[PDB]
Amino acid sequence: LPRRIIKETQRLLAEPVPGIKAEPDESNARYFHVVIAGPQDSPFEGGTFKLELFLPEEYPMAAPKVRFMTKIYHPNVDKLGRIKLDILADKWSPALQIRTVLLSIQALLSAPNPDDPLANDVAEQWKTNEAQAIETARAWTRLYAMNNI
């Protein structure tokens, strides 16, 4: 039970962030049940996206394991909800916390990057027909990312 995890968990419950919820599992304080609000002025606006976060044993020297549990139409997230984000891999910082990681993921929904894709189909559709991809994502947000709590 690294004390960092205790204090992080402590401040997430005490000092909450708008549009982000992260509660620990009573069975494993290293596993967090997360809900992310879709960023405004984004196809995902109005969505509530569920994510699983797990803290490996090397935390904070290694990034958390985070994957989407709700289905999402995004160039940088695949069918299993696995996320390709530098801060969760190569450009991780041990000064990042669960708070900033989740905000970072929220930023990614605001600023999709198709050029480097993880879901190649969605990425091409975003580039070939940006307007249709947006409409799809706005739909998927209503279908899968609403009434899901």
Partner: protein, 76 residues
Amino acid sequence: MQIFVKTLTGKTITLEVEPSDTIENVKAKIQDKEGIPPDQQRLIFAGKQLEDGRTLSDYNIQKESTLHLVLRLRGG
């Protein structure tokens, strides 16, 4: 006008800004107090990654609004 910035650790700094100020101006004031080069700063407000060009007014950031500080992130 004073806005708030929640830094990495969670420490909240207070910054005097004007609604006509660009995001770049904000990063600079953050840099003077926290020592993070603007190319490493990203500011999040209402889930949006605030862009360097636009202004606080362009985002409807009013008095006592909190921005959240994050490091350079890239979707891949």
